[PDB]
Design an enzyme around this catalytic site. Structure first.
Site, PDB file in Angstrom:
ATOM      1  N   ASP A   1       0.812  -1.215   0.000  1.00  6.99           N
ATOM      2  CA  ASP A   1       0.000   0.000   0.000  1.00  6.99           C
ATOM      3  C   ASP A   1       0.847   1.266   0.000  1.00  6.99           C
ATOM      4  OD1 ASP A   1      -2.864  -0.113  -0.164  1.00  6.99           O
ATOM      5  OD2 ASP A   1      -2.855  -1.297   1.685  1.00  6.99           O
ATOM      6  N   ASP A   2       1.547   1.513   1.102  1.00  4.34           N
ATOM      7  CA  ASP A   2       2.531   2.581   1.172  1.00  4.34           C
ATOM      8  C   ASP A   2       3.744   2.196   1.997  1.00  4.34           C
ATOM      9  OD1 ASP A   2       1.859   4.720  -0.454  1.00  4.34           O
ATOM     10  OD2 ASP A   2       0.383   5.501   0.973  1.00  4.34           O
ATOM     11  N   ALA A   3       3.751   1.012   2.597  1.00  5.64           N
ATOM     12  CA  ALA A   3       4.862   0.578   3.416  1.00  5.64           C
ATOM     13  C   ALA A   3       6.123   0.428   2.570  1.00  5.64           C
ATOM     14  CB  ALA A   3       4.519  -0.734   4.112  1.00  5.64           C
TER      15      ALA A   3
END
Ligand SMILES: [Zn+2]
Lengths: 62, 256, 58, 64, 69, 98, 304, 115, 57, 131, 171
Positions: K153-155
């Site tokens: 996702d954004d990790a």
RNA sequence: AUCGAGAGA
């Protein structure tokens, strides 16, 4: 400025009803930042050992 | 135990596959798994016997209860000579064959995906997903099949085999597309964002026609005949009136 | 006020210490700049509260 | 109020770029004026998202 | 602050090269690329560690509480 | 101890079995998988790590018959040892020669 | 079929260079699953000696104690890992460290100003005494019987000119670090290799002949020593593909996109082992191969 | 976060052996998913990766002040010329190898140096 | 009294200035990093009046 | 046993965004109204335009096991052998039937008169090709 | 004008005015303009686009309309503007270096990055404001790869060995 | 306990 009476303790969002009967603080709960994991079941959650030792469940012996 | 039963049966995760707002699914894989599936389920993917077996055992693990047959069952290769070669669609077929319960027919589903047939060349039919007895025979698995999409393979598996089998299929596809993306990693870079010389010349040629569109639109809005100069005094006066008047300003904005 | 960076580091502050803030109870504070009307200029104003002020007020 | 949409553009400039038409791509970069206009649009979007995140919070409780 | 003893990406010891890098820049009119090459830093992961070090400990050291100033 | 037989996934006749190995990873897993797939009698072989954060490795062996998954595992381990010995010997000889 | 005899018949090693720090050798006709096992074991399974426990007695410097201890731990040592055993962590610290598993270093440096400093000078080595603390100042203190075993080989850092700390007059550092055996999978400070990787031998398949002025630029699209020109006909050919790093500069040109394909030799690995200083790269590779063999043997002897 | 708004938490400390390694032997210390880019459109991060690798190779510093390039003189062209001169490839792609299996990945991976 | 004004931000005035708000005139100059610190001295505020509002022009 | 057999003349070959596979257009040399479009792995069996192929569909080659010594099969007489499933039958016109096969994803459309294609039943069938 | 602003010549001096330097095109010298007079004067953004008998001024450089933080963003004309704004907001939330005289302070909280580095990619205004005295972050080798599956996702994924060599460490 | 500044999704 005026001192809150007994009516103001039970009036609005901060009043007794909406803040202590329609929403409460709870024992046996936890909060943390969420990180992804694809090696865990899609119906599962990954709980750190820090939570896993504090949270507990009453299991009666038999 | 009352709240335990309530959470494991009524509020649990796999019994909420579909939102009550419109009945559409709300669960599934998102980005890396979707691109991994698009790369795995194309005609260009072939796997030797050891690679095929490794992918199958990576996604499906009978000792964890992932298999309904207590013993992993495989398929004959799609190529027999010169040497055996499987296909990614055969990996999907084997995944379904091992997680779907036995003593039941395979899923018969005919659907589409988001990628047209012009993105695979002339005469391709990879836009038309096709299952038959639980065997992916055509098309590519996409966002429309695994993910939050109605009438995809995961939704159909949910409908035909209950919520548990759809949950297991989501988990197995997640593990499969994770292990595949490790060995054949996915990446993006600067060359993906570039046009060709002909593409750049097309863009320049078309954008050279945008120089006069604002002037033409202003002339149309101000009820002035076309081919009028951009600094004509009457055009400037009309544009001043339009600037003063909010509605005329909005009309000019809409036309331009 | 006029100490060179050498004297500034000698007096324990910083090499390029900048000003513009106050110290109160050991906690540094700044008077934030605010935007206000241009001075000495009569600017025409249309505002509904001007009419809301009373009656016959435009 | 002077008919200029930016100091760079002459008053009542009948040009698409003046009115906010960005003929530029994030691969090659956008000019300073188009950068200014795109900042306008992005600020408006951020404001709208901030408002919309809770503009519909009273309705759910009033119904429920 | 102080030169990192080992390169982050690979692990080649670059902590013993900061002073020699400064000497190569000062005495000889070697630019950073030639100096890094002569120091034996081949991979750009190793080159960045000495090319971009700031050495803030020199500025930290002037505030000595154990010496009369 | 270190090697563990997952009895809930092992065939009654022993032809198929699943093994769990602690403190192992891709290093030994892939080598064992490659050296076991060379067995003409094995039908299915693969390795899987359940979770990356844990130090456990899973080995699945399915033989065609006349043997056992345990026997296939033993043969693979012996052949891996022999491969390591031959590469070490050749490297030693090349070091000496130069 | 496949057999160890066939692998022995088809296996070869081509050692291209061998120094005290870097060895460059080839593994020919071996499987990626085995080459990768060797690479991984070299990186993070070969034991080495590095500082683990640090006993500060005083640190009045700018560098904090944890940063100083970490920076000391990152220093590589010229210690043969076979000369000491492994620490049994279950034991209490009173007798956890013995004379045959731990090497005790020490650092005692106190900065004082130099009164004889020339006027107008800025060099800290003339202004101050012990202005810079180096790794060579990590004095080895033999303990117990190891005063006889380490007599021939002193415990000195692989790099003695590592800048561990800086000081100003009045500031002193006094610590005592214990260094023990550990693997690079536990902490990166233990990995005995700077980098130990490999690569597939590049393959440059010339499909159509390139001659004349075209062959001039085709050679330049690669490193200079790879592509050559035949003396008889002004053709192009691959002299040494080992000297090629795959930059695919050819594929940028439509002139040569249809006249050559780039690939690899999937069972020809080009290893490159650089050591930190504790041991030679050839011994590192020896120990990695032996570690894989002993791991397989221990698994075999484990009772299923 | 980088200097382009590409924030994100850290999931796992990936061991270096399991990390993908390049042909030159260097394993990246930060892995960012390529799927973070298409929605945000932070092409400046790609350009910064290109220029950072080129500057680290050539020992120089690259200025990133806005509006120093244009349509004719693309930063991709400029930093690609520098990378090709240094011997790496024009588009910033590096042939990498899987750290868990060992085989070369399907395509060249986009690597570089960003702040 | 000046120290109270700087510590609280409250503009305790018996006459009232030509300003709208009465509180939050002084911010605490945070030292998370130099970028934060330097930007503290370059910011100009519209006022606390417009924070509690709905019009967005 | 065999279910179909003919000598086909390949007429068009194009990769089409692929590297290992390609889609061909083969017209029968003898039968005047029999044609073929097939996807083949052109890295294990390269083909060219204006080639000639001997395709054959067989119900068997006399559970899968890697080939061992002393094993005879129909595949030994052919170069490239696939294995798939019939999933569709179409009636293009009178006395013209089109049969659709899918070999693990690679699609074949064998169109011909039903006098010769009557043996082709909707089941798993081996495809064999020879130069 | 026609129903525009009230005409007149309004000279201003005194305190609190907002002023910016802009190059006066005749005689090519620095000029100072304010918001009141700016909205009626033509100010080209680049000397390449001066129009005859149109522009009277020109910017010294296009970058002197941005803040300091906005100038320190690398290649910000290639980014989406919300991402530039997020960068401006997050560059002041970094665990960087507050200062060097940290032994003579008693602040309630301090976040200091142990080892910072000067960026390889930096604007020309990075040196002018002397930001080298305050290194904010570090240079890292970043691969844009979908390989782990743990960073969707954004990790993001940090090399463990790099982290074990004091990468990103702070106090 | 209250009112002011700010921060995270
Ligand atoms: Zn390095």
């Amino acid at each position: 400025v005026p001192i809150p009476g007994v009516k103001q303790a039970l009036e609005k969002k901060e009043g007794l009803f909406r803040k202590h009967m329609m929403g409460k603080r709870v024992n046996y709960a936890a909060r943390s930042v969420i990180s992804p994991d694809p090696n865990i079941e899609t119906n599962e959650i990954g709980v750190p050992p820090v939570f896993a030792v504090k949270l507990t469940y009453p299991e009666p012996v038999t | 135990e009352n709240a335990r039963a309530e959470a494991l049966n009524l509020a649990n995760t796999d019994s909420q596959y579909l939102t009550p707002t419109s009945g559409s699914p709300v669960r599934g894989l998102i980005q890396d798994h979707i691109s991994a599936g698009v790369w795995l389920t194309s005609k260009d993917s072939f796997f030797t016997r050891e690679q095929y077996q490794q992918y199958i055992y990576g996604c499906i693990r009978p000792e964890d209860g992932h298999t309904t047959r207590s013993k992993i069952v495989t398929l004959p290769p799609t190529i027999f000579k010169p040497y055996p070669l499987w296909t990614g669609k055969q990996i999907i077929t084997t995944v379904l064959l091992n997680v779907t319960p036995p003593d039941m027919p395979g899923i018969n589903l005919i659907s589409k995906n988001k990628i047209k047939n012009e993105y695979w060349g002339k005469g391709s039919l990879e836009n038309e997903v096709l299952f038959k007895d639980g065997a992916l025979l055509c098309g590519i698995l996409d966002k429309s099949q695994y993910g939050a999409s109605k009438y995809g393979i995961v939704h159909s598996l949910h409908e035909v085999y209950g919520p548990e089998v759809a949950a297991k299929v989501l988990s197995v596809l997640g593990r499969l597309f994770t292990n595949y993306i490790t060995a054949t990693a996915f990446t993006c870079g600067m060359d993906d964002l570039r046009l060709t010389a002909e593409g750049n010349k097309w863009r320049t040629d078309i954008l050279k026609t945008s120089v006069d569109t604002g002037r033409e639109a202003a002339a149309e809005v101000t009820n002035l005949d076309k081919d009028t100069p951009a600094d004509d005094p009457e055009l400037l006066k009309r544009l001043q009136e339009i600037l003063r008047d909010n509605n005329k300003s909005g009309i000019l904005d809409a036309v331009t | 006020n006029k100490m060179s960076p050498y004297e500034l580091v000698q007096h324990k502050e910083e090499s390029d210490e900048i000003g513009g803030y106050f110290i109160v109870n050991g906690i540094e504070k700044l008077i934030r700049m605010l935007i206000v009307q241009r001075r000495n200029h009569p600017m025409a104003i249309i505002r509904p509260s001007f009419a809301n002020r009373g009656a016959s007020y435009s | 109020v002077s008919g200029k949409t930016l100091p760079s553009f002459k008053p009542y400039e009948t040009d698409a770029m003046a009115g906010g038409y960005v003929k530029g791509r994030f691969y090659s970069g956008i000019k300073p004026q188009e950068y200014y206009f795109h900042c306008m649009a992005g600020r408006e979007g951020l404001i709208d998202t901030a408002v919309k995140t809770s503009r519909s919070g009273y309705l759910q409780r009033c119904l429920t | 602050m102080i030169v990192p003893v080992r390169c982050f990406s690979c692990g080649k010891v670059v902590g013993d090269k900061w002073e020699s890098y400064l000497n190569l820049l000062q005495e000889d009119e070697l630019d950073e690329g030639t100096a890094l090459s002569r120091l034996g830093l081949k991979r750009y992961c190793c080159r960045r560690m000495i090319l971009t070090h700031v050495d803030l400990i020199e500025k930290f050291l002037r505030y000595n509480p154990l010496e009369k100033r | 101890e270190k090697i563990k037989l997952l009895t809930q996934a092992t065939s009654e006749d022993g032809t198929s079995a699943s093994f769990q190995i602690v403190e192992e990873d891709h290093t030994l897993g892939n080598a064992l998988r490659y050296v076991i797939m060379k067995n003409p009698d094995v039908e299915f072989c693969g390795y899987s790590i359940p979770h990356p954060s844990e130090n456990l490795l899973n080995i699945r062996i399915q033989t065609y018959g006349e043997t056992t998954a345990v026997d296939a595992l033993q043969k693979g381990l012996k052949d891996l040892m022999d491969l390591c010995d031959v590469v070490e010997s050749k490297f030693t000889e090349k070091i000496k020669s130069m | 079929e496949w057999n160890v005899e066939k692998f022995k018949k088809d296996f070869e090693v081509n050692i291209s260079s061998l120094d005290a720090r870097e060895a460059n050798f080839d593994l020919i006709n071996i499987d990626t699953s085995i080459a990768n096992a060797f690479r991984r074991i070299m990186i993070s399974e070969v034991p080495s000696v590095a500082a683990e426990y640090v006993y500060f007695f005083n640190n009045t410097s700018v560098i904090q104690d944890e940063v100083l201890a970490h920076r000391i731990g990152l220093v590589p040592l010229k210690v043969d890992p076979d000369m000491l055993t492994w620490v049994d962590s279950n034991l209490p610290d009173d007798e956890k460290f013995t004379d045959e598993n731990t090497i005790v270093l020490s650092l005692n440096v106190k900065c004082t100003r130099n009164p004889d400093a020339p006027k107008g000078s800025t060099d800290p080595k003339e202004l101050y005494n012990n202005a810079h603390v180096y790794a060579r100042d990590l004095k080895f203190e033999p303990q117990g019987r190891q005063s006889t075993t380490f007599a021939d080989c002193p415990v000195v850092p692989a790099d003695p000119d590592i800048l561990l700390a800086k000081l100003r007059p009045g500031q002193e550092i006094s610590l005592k670090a214990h260094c023990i055996l550990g693997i690079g999978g536990d902490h990166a400070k233990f990995s005995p290799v700077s980098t130990a990787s490999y690569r597939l031998l590049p393959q440059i398949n010339i499909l159509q002949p390139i001659k004349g002025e075209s062959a001039r630029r085709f050679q330049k699209c690669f490193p200079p020593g790879v592509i050559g020109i035949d003396e008889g006909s002004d053709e192009a050919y691959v002299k040494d593909a080992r000297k090629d790093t795959v930059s695919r500069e050819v594929l940028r040109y439509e002139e040569f996109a249809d006249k050559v394909k780039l690939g690899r030799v999937r069972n020809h690995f080009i290893f490159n082992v650089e050591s930190a200083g504790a041991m030679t790269p050839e011994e590192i590779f020896f120990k990695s191969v032996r570690i894989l063999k002993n791991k397989a043997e221990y698994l075999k002897n484990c009772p299923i | 976060s980088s200097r382009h708004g590409q924030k994100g938490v850290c999931s796992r400390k990936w061991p270096t052996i399991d990390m993908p390694f390049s042909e030159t032997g260097i394993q990246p210390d930060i892995i960012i998913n390529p799927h973070a880019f298409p929605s945000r459109m932070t092409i400046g991060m790609f350009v910064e990766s290109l220029a950072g690798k080129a500057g680290a190779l050539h020992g120089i510093a690259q200025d990133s002040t806005p509006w120093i390039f244009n349509e004719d003189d693309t930063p991709a062209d400029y930093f690609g010329e520098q990378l090709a001169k240094a011997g790496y490839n024009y588009h910033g792609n590096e042939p990498m190898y899987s750290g868990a299996t060992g085989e070369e990945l399907r395509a060249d991976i986009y690597v570089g140096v960003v702040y | 009294k000046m120290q109270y004004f700087l510590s609280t931000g409250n503009l305790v005035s018996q006459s009232g200035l030509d300003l709208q708000q009465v509180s939050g005139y002084t911010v605490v100059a945070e030292k998370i990093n130099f970028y934060r610190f330097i930007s503290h001295f370059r910011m100009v505020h519209r006022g606390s009046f417009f924070a509690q509002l709905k019009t967005t022009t | 046993n065999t279910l179909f057999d003919d000598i086909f003349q390949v007429s068009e070959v194009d990769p089409g965004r692929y590297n290992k596979v390609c889609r061909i257009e083969a017209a029968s040399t003898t039968q005047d109204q029999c044609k073929l479009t097939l996807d083949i792995n052109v890295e294990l069996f390269p083909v060219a335009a204006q080639d000639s192929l001997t395709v054959t569909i067989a119900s068997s080659l006399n559970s899968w096991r890697p080939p061992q010594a002393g094993d005879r099969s129909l595949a030994d007489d052919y170069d490239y052998v696939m294995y798939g499933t019939a999933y569709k039958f179409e009636e293009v016109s009178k006395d013209l039937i089109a049969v659709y096969y899918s070999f693990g994803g690679l699609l074949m459309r064998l169109e011909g008169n039903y006098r010769n294609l009557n043996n082709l039943k909707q089941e798993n069938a081996y495809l064999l090709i020879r130069r | 004008s026609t129903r525009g602003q009230y005409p007149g010549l309004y000279l201003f001096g005194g305190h609190s005015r907002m002023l910016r330097p802009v190059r006066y095109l005749p005689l090519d010298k620095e000029d100072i303009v304010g918001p009141f007079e700016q909205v009626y004067m033509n100010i080209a953004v680049t000397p390449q686009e001066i129009q005859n008998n149109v522009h009277t001024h020109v910017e010294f450089t296009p970058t002197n309309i941005l803040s300091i933080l906005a100038n320190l963003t690398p290649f910000s004309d290639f980014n989406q503007s919300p991402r530039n704004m997020y960068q401006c907001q997050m560059g002041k939330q970094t665990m960087g270096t507050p200062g060097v005289a940290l032994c003579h302070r008693s602040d309630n909280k301090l976040y200091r990055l142990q080892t910072g580095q000067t960026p390889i990619v930096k604007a020309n205004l990075y040196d002018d404001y002397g930001m080298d005295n305050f290194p904010n972050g570090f240079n890292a080798v970043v691969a844009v790869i979908s390989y782990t599956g743990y960073d969707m996702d954004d990790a993001m994924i940090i090399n463990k060995s790099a982290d074990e060599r004091g990468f990103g460490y702070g106090t």
